Amino acid sequence: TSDDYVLRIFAIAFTRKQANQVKRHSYAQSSHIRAIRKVISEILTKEVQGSTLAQLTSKLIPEVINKEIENATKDIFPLQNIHVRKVKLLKQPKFDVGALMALHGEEKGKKVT
């Protein structure tokens, strides 16, 4: 992220059969699988760099990202069960309390006598 959170993302999807399908299986030949993984890599990279971690998790909750994937991958091949499987945080920057306070939205004590 632009705030220097290095993350690792894992995206999972599945092939689906068309409405008028008669073939039992819905396998895809490799050159889709290679072109699928490319567009998945592009969109995931574009979103994370173009969003802060606080902004990033904001996208995760509605699962918007899967929908752009679904639209992005619609031409190449119909998919199903598109999901961001797992998210890892490999490295963190120097901690900033001020930013943390903003994300969570000082106090005088009481005389002991």
Positions touching another protein (CB under 8 A) are 2-4, 52, 55, 58-59, 62, 64, 67-68, 71-72, 93-94, 96, 98-99, 102, 105-113
Task: Give me the amino acid identity at 93.
Answer: P
> Shortest approach of another protein to residue 42 CB, angstroms?
13
Nearer of residues 21 and 58 to another protein, judged by Cβ:
58
SS3 labels along 58-88: HHHCCCHHHHHHHHHCCCCCCEEEEEEEEEE
> Shortest approach of another protein to residue 112 CB, angstroms?
5
> Shortest approach of another protein to residue 50 CB, angstroms?
8
Nearer of residues 85 and 110 to another protein, judged by Cβ:
110
Instruction: Locate 98 and state its tokens.
Output: 């001020």
> Shortest approach of another protein to residue 113 CB, angstroms?
7
Please say whether the dihedral angle defined by the alpha carbons of residues 55, 58, 60 and 62, taken in this order, is positive or negative.
Answer: negative
* Residue 81 to residue 2: CA distance in whole angstroms: 29
